Structure formats: structure tokens, C-alpha cells
Amino acid sequence: SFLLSKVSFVIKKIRLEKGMTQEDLAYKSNLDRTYISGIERNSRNLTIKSLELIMKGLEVSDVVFFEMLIKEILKHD
Amino acid sequence: ESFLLSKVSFVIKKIRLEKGMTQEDLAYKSNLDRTYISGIERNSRNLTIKSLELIMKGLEVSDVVFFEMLIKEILK
DNA sequence: ATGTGACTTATAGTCCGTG
DNA sequence: TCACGGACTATAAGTCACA
Numbered sequence: 001s002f003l004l005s006k007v008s009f010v011i012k013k014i015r016l017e018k019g020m021t022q023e024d025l026a027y028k029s030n031l032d033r034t035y036i037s038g039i040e041r042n043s044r045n046l047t048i049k050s051l052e053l054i055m056k057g058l059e060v061s062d063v064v065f066f067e068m069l070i071k072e073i074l075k076h077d
Numbered sequence: 078e079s080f081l082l083s084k085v086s087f088v089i090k091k092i093r094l095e096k097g098m099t100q101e102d103l104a105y106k107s108n109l110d111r112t113y114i115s116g117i118e119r120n121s122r123n124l125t126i127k128s129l130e131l132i133m134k135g136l137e138v139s140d141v142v143f144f145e146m147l148i149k150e151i152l153k
Numbered sequence: 154a155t156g157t158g159a160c161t162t163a164t165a166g167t168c169c170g171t172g
Numbered sequence: 173t174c175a176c177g178g179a180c181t182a183t184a185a186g187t188c189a190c191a
Contacts, residue, residue: 001126001127001130002130002140003126003129003130003140004126004127007126045125045126045127046125046126047123047124047125047126048079048081048082048085048123048124048125048126048129049079049081049082049123051081051126052079052080052081052082055081062080062081062084062148062151063148063151063152066144066147066148066151067148069144070141070144070145073140073141073144074141
């Protein structure tokens with residue numbers, strides 16, 4: 001899956017920009033630390049609701065997240 | 078009771094009706110069961126990103142177009 | 154046509170760990 | 173702190189019999 005690797009790239013990018021650990025993100029997302037790791041390393045198939053939890057844990061608006069996703073989708077060569 | 082979910086379901090339906098397609102046509106094109114797509118449009122199915130990809134492919138819409146439409150629906 | 158409850162099967166997502 | 177794995181539970185995927 002093409003889209004999952006882009007979602008998971010954007011998640012890890014924002015997390016690092018915010019200086020958050022995977023545990024910080026797990027805690028603010030109401031998700032397990034190993035699930036955050038799984039998402040980032042293995043581009044796990046998130047639900048819409050868990051994606052929403054994560055964007056909330058990253059403290060980014062949905063719009064900003066989806067604009068970054070679009071950027072990552074349009075990246076080429 | 079999810080803000081994002083209600084926006085995603087509204088966009089899938091909006092594009093489906095824009096393409097003049099029935100849920101059954103969408104089922105055919107996405108290889109998903111029509112009663113499964115009904116549940117999504119009715120906001121009663123927390124779909125994964127994989128399922129959303131099959132739906133977007135079924136709608137013959139690019140990810141970028143779908144996301145731009147989702148952004149606009151979020152801003153309304 | 155679409156909608157829905159009530160399922161079975163597959164997997165999202167949690168919990169217990171390690172080096 | 174995080175990659176990685178076993179084993180588990182909660183819930184999504186997928187289906188159908190109605191409505």
C-alpha cells in the first residue's frame with residue numbers, strides 16, 4: 001500500500017519536528033507505544049478514527065496533516 | 078461520533094453521486110460489498126486507510142483530488 | 154435502488170516482554 | 173527510547189437475510 005507509507009512518513013515527520021517521543025505520542029493519542037512504532041516502521045493499516053487520534057496527539061490540524069500528505073503524494077523522481 | 082469519519086463518509090458519497098454511480102456500481106468497481114459501502118456512507122463503519130484506497134480507486138478519483146475535497150469539507 | 158442487524162473471519166490495536 | 177516479537181482482545185472486513 002502506497003497511501004499507508006505516505007501517512008506513516010508524515011506521522012513520523014511531524015512527531016520529530018515536535019520533538020516528541022513515540023511514548024509522548026502514544027499517550028496523547030490514547031494508543032499503545034508499540035502501535036506508534038508499528039505505524040512508523042511498518043506503515044500499519046490505521047483506521048480513520050485512529051488517524052484522527054494521532055493528528056490530535058501531534059497537535060496538528062487535520063487540514064495541515066492532509067496538506068503535508070498531499071505534498072508527500074506529489075513528491076516525484 | 079467522529080469528526081473526521083463524518084467528513085470522510087460525506088466526501089465518498091458526494092463524489093459517488095457526482096460520478097452518477099450507485100453504491101452497487103461503486104461495489105463493482107472497488108470490489109467491495111454494496112451493503113459495506115452503505116454502512117460507510119451512513120457513518121457507521123470506522124474504515125481503514127486500505128479500504129479507503131479501494132474506494133478511491135473505485136470512484137476513479139486520485140488520492141490528491143480526494144484529499145483536496147476532504148480539506149474543503151473540513152473547512153466548511 | 155438503499156438500509157440495517159446479526160453474524161463469521163481477518164486484523165487493528167493492546168499488553169507483555171527483550172537487547 | 174525504540175526496534176522488534178509473542179500472544180492476546182477489541183473491532184474492522186466481509187456477507188447475507190431481510191426491510
